[PDB]
Amino acid sequence: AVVENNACEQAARMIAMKNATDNAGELISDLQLIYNKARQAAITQEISEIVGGAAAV
Amino acid sequence: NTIVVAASASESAALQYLAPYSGCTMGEYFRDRGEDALIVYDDLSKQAVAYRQISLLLRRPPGREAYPGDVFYL
Amino acid sequence: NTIVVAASASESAALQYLAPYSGCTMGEYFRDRGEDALIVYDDLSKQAVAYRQISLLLRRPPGREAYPGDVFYL
Amino acid sequence: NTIVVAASASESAALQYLAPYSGCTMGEYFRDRGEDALIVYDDLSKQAVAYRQISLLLRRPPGREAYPGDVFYLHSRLLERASRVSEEYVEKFTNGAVTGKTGSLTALPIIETQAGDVSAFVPTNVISITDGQIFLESAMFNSGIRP
Amino acid sequence: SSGRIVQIIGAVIDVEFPRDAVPSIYEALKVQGVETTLEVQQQLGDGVVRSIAMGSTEGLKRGLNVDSTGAAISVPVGKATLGRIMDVLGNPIDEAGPIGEEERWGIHREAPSYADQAGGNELLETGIKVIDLVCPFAKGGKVGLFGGAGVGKTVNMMELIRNIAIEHSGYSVFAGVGERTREGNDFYHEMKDSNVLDKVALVYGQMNEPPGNRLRVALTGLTMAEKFRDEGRDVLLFIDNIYRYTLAGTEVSALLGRMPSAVGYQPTLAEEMGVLQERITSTKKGSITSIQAVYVPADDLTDPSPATTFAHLDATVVLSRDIASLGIYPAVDPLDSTSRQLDPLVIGQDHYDTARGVQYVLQRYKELKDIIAILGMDELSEADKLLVARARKIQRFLSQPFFVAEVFTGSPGKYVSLKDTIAGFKGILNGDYDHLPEQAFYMVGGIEEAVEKAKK
Amino acid sequence: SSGRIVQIIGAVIDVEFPRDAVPSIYEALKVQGVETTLEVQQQLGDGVVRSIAMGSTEGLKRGLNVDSTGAAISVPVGKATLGRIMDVLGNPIDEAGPIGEEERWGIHREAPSYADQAGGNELLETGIKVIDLVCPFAKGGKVGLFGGAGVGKTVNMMELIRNIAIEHSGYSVFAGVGERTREGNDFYHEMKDSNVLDKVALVYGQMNEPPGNRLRVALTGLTMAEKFRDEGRDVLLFIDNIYRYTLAGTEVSALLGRMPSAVGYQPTLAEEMGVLQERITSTKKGSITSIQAVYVPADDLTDPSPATTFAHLDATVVLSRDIASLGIYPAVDPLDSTSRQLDPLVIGQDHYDTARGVQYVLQRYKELKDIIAILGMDELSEADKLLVARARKIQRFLSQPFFVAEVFTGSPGKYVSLKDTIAGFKGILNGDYDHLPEQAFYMVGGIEEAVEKAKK
Amino acid sequence: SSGRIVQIIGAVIDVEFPRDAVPSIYEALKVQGVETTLEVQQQLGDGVVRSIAMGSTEGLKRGLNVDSTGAAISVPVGKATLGRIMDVLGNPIDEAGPIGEEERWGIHREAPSYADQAGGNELLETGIKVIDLVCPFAKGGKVGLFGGAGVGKTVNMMELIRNIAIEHSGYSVFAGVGERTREGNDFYHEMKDSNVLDKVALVYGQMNEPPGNRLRVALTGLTMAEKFRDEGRDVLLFIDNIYRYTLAGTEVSALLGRMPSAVGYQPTLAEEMGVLQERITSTKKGSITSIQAVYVPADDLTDPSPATTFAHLDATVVLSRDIASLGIYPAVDPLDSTSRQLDPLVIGQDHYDTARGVQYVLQRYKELKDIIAILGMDELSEADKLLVARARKIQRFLSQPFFVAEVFTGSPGKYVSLKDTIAGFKGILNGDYDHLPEQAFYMVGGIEEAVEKAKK
Amino acid sequence: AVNAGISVSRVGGAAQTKIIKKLSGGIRTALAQYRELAAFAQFASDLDEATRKQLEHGQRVTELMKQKQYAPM
Ligand SMILES: Nc1ncnc2c1ncn2[C@@H]1O[C@H](COP(=O)(O)OP(=O)(O)O)[C@@H](O)[C@H]1O
Ligand SMILES: Nc1ncnc2c1ncn2[C@@H]1O[C@H](COP(=O)(O)OP(=O)(O)O)[C@@H](O)[C@H]1O
Ligand SMILES: Nc1ncnc2c1ncn2[C@@H]1O[C@H](COP(=O)(O)OP(=O)(O)O)[C@@H](O)[C@H]1O
């Protein structure tokens, strides 16, 4: 019973580490969409500042 | 039973910006006379892109995502 | 034991811009005469916003976040 | 066996903007005469910075990262000279003095990225223009993997 | 002497007058044949003034004659305004005939002096658990409801109007600034059918209106509230959306020849808010209790407009799209919401310690979000597991079925006293309900109802 | 009457003309005594026009005479263009002498009207199994081609060029937008060695040419394709890179001083894409179908350039590095490739069920392959083991020998009908060929050839 | 002949001169009746020049007369400058009376020619563990201390001045560019009390001074160092913040009529920086050893100012806010910091291997740190567990108490030689201290002090 | 709410009276080290006496630094 429970423990751990690997993939995907949105906003703000400063000079 | 108003991807941005108001005016004809009408604007986000083009060509100062200050009023 | 200098939200941007310097001059009276004083500036960020407004209305060319080039010197 | 063309940090931005074209012209001498040459542009990013300065002082309209509308043309005009020409081109150019030999100019342009960001305006242009890219990594360099 | 229109660009019109007869700033002008009203904003020199039209400019042409009225835009004030609907210029728009005012007041006025300010901390019970717990209100103070599109600013303001009118017997002013025309009709018929209309003055300048109307309608509503305050009364002032007043200024700023500031806003953003916000205050003569809905562009709380608004309020209620997505309403964020009244010397140590205890548990649960998403609750310490279970019960117990929201779900509304609010959260923090399932605390008015729901 | 150059700023040239002889927008101008051509972009007033030079401006000076041609840039059209390389202006860039055209057309025109639309949705049979089954092309449609380098992109274009010409009596046009001179030369020899050069017209707009050249090359190739469409044919238009067309517009817009939009793109981004893409359609006389390679900046599919381009694409073909490693050609991913015509209402229930059946088996095999790799083949049941066997047969049956790839593959090329394609995959899915070995399905035209190959 | 002031906007002043008497670029002008000097920046045409003031503008008026001095700003040089405090114009700002000058030099000069450049590599021991290990300096080279606000640039420079300048046989120059007035006074009394002042010339431009002062103090200090270098001497040059020279240019750039570049910096950023940095160099006549503190805006090493500065230096010392946040000082980043002298042919194989060994261990620990925070230390391999303990010991052994920092640390300062440094790191890398606790290596000095601290 | 790791005083011990100068020596950096150690050892199975003692002291000093408004010492 003790030896069989150890085989069950490693099988339960395999599934748990597979799920942990999959959940990390979702977090990376959500952060990538937030990063791309921030990347586009920074370029747009910089161009607004360049055009605004050039129109005053 | 339907009126179709079209402003395709190659028509002038002025017509794309104005098409919703022309369709709305044709739909209002029934409302004001005590009748019922239904209107579909297939893409209001394309209307906003057309209005941004005219505003930038007129050199009006842009806001968030480069849209005009009056994009909400549109 | 305290002098209170006020330049509230509805007062002219020029008064909000000058208030820190006015309070500083009132505090310097004690320093130059061999005494100790303490001064608190409520929000140097609000004084910078007041200076940006005056500078943009005077049409001086803007920099980062539309602030004038001399906001450090202020 | 090497020609060294220098445009130092204290020299006029016009000289820094022109130096790659001067060096390319000296390298093309061998290509057109049925010989092989190799050219290294130690910083095409510094050449772009010098051209941006001249453009802004001449009051030309700015674009992304304040560069002028022709910053892609600046590097494309330079990098298309590096090429391999046929035997007929060499025979035509040399008026038959050199026969049955091809000529070439190989280029190794260098670009500096900021914190690994290859998506910046100038790096994006040069990556699209070139025939290949050798990427060097800060993490590998710290890990003892010197190249 | 009359002037002539020299230029027209959108809502902005330039008029030329004789050098000896130039109208003053904020003076009201009228176009001769069309009767359109214009407000002078700037003196450009050489007899030319720049103005904003208080109506549609379609059909106007260069060369039309303009008359100066000698004074600023003036509106009716006092008892005659109660139970009636008015536009930005003070005209009746309810089809109930002309207003019977005894006097008219100009919409532009200076804020009350430093010596006129009134000090007060008298607690106002709202009957809403989350508001009464973490951000309590005070009579004669200012409240702001911050939130993105679709999160609940109007539903929460309608519930506050319903609950505060129970213990308040004075007059009320409601200013509809740049919002839905349907919401104005719905509120008007609701008060007319409830027989409450004769205690409220209504001012409306909705989304359909031109920029000039949306830019001045907030001043018209506030001018009516200032008459009642100066008469020595206690009045309630509700503003449908204060952000629309700022946005109307952005739409017109470029036409007025001003350089844009950060993210395209007018350079005068902070001054425009200060000139309006300092007038909405209680004085030694009488008090104004005010609730304002504050829109947040693209859900970004760091945006210059919301960011500049926080400094003008006594109580800040922040609504969140994440909380609303979990089905928890009113959807108030307990970590971002705050009030100056949350002080031991005002609310007493019991309420203060309970609110502090709730914020401590919610802050600690927030820090465990990424650990729980990758490894789950089983890898947490026994102390963290106990805290997570209480945090989940606290989040659900903050939810409440509103009386105005009964139309959306059929669930009866609930009113909760401050006594019952403190008792419920204190019991959950001390562990008196550690055996109840977390779903028992969702949409229950009082802690007793959670105990009954757990038996199902 | 002629005009004079008044100002030169890089590629932007301003020319002054007599008040009654000002050239029209998009009109082509010629500098006297030089081969430089200018295209009018704007009319500035006082007889001055702003133009973009179609070549290097080095050596030009103020006061040079400029002649108006009376029309837009005009290019040679018809059979005379096949097997020749041309620039943006239609000049031959190969040393094969002058083009023998009988007619010339201007590069600027309106898209076919609402009444000219062909109407019914018809498929374009490519003769390639994987494309015709998983991502069918509609006549007059636009196809996005994705993938890296060294994965068969040139070989796929050459096979499509061969099939439209030999099996459908059509023609092809290649538009090299921002073409690399080394690759443009290599491609010309590969088509000559593959005997497909006489079936295609080549237009190159090389990377070392000014922004105006790179921007207009797409319209030059499209104008040549419009002539072949009007001859009553079905035509293929290949665009080397649609991203470079977008960038050339950004460069020209910056040179002209227009205020930039979001992410720095030209304010006219959506309109410039629409003007190009709306001409590529199926009309009552014939059709132009287009295959366009697409580049995604910073791998961000939400960036304005990819996002504006995807609104016009009818299909997506994804080339895979992993599939090419298995020796399967063409290396097209059956799970990542997509098509708007893969709908039972457009292609019928039989074709749709067969295509969805193949995708389901390949998707489940992808999952089972991970189980075999981590736990071993003994974990799979007899139903899973049978599915793995069918997936391997389907995966190999998608491979095909091309007439232009006979040098690489040795075996003779094959053209496979849609009827033969559907019947073959339907039979494998139904298990009718479960007795044949997996190697019998590799590099064969149809299911019949697989049955015959299994006897060797 | 004299000119007249025509316009004043901030620090920028326009002066009109007769068309035959216009002053040259960089020429110094004196305002009549006021103690203010102007430096000509541009010739605008029509006899007008644009200039920057070297004094306060509160006393200026339009129409004041201005005199041309016929030369650039000229400052006193040589032996008379030692032990004195001067302003941007070379006036004494101490109370010791007029300077006994014998010669004056203009502050603007061309950089040494390519043929005049030096090639020395003699190592310079600093007594600081991190610097002597991964950033070894050389005589006549350029050193840069990069870092955000509050990370230790002044404290590190003061320790370097103590360990190098006090024992030096030659002269020193200190340039206070945009520095705190308190730091300048504290340094003056420390040099005076230490009896070192007789070997140092001090030039200051505090941050309360007009943009013209802060824009030129770096040139005044460098002019004094060039006189000593050209006399055939070996000189030390210290600059408290080279970023202030760049920032003063940004404050004035837009008023000089220049369009802004990326991040709002002046378009001339790289040229302005190069014109100064190419003069700070060693030549065949004499040597200049220089240490420059470099401010990093918001800790971002990618900002255009820090990014443009790296290419000008031989040794780059990067101070990290993340290391300073752990209470570890001097806070030098062992992975981002580097020196041209880190070569086996310059320092030998034992030092080079020890330096690369430390970097390898720290680089490997950086990628294991995030794992321990999620799964814990016990989930790692036998090799990783051992390596993490050594990495945490190395990280602490890099710390050191400085004599100039006793006011902050309370404990006495320590000086550690290169051999002691190498022996300590080799022992920790080889495992000679695996039994000592992690806390024994923090703020101790040499390796024997860690062994002694562990017993306490 | 004072973040001891990011906060700093450039005058240091010169701005303090002798009694508080000697008793408070090294507290600022000790709390900064405790923040890193408490995060690193959050999931550790067992820890040495030096680590256990540092965590016990860091928690007590963290608790000691709390104070009420209008209650100066
Ligand atoms: N308790 C609630 N139950 C259901 N919906 C609610 C509740 N509270 C708020 N809402 C939602 O709030 C929205 C209206 O608020 P909002 O759009 O922010 O206000 P405004 O009308 O000022 O724009 C509606 O979508 C409504 O469904
Ligand atoms: N149908 C095919 N059969 C065999 N090999 C092929 C086939 N298609 C492509 N290849 C191989 O791929 C190589 C590169 O193909 P190519 O079309 O030129 O890709 P790319 O243009 O991206 O470099 C060919 O030289 C050939 O070796
Ligand atoms: N070696 C050090 N030992 C102890 N504290 C230091 C040390 N170096 C820097 N500091 C800390 O940082 C401050 C000094 O930073 P400073 O030299 O002024 O940096 P910067 O000039 O770059 O802003 C001191 O007040 C002290 O708290």
Ligand SMILES: [Mg+2]
């Ligand atoms: Mg400093």
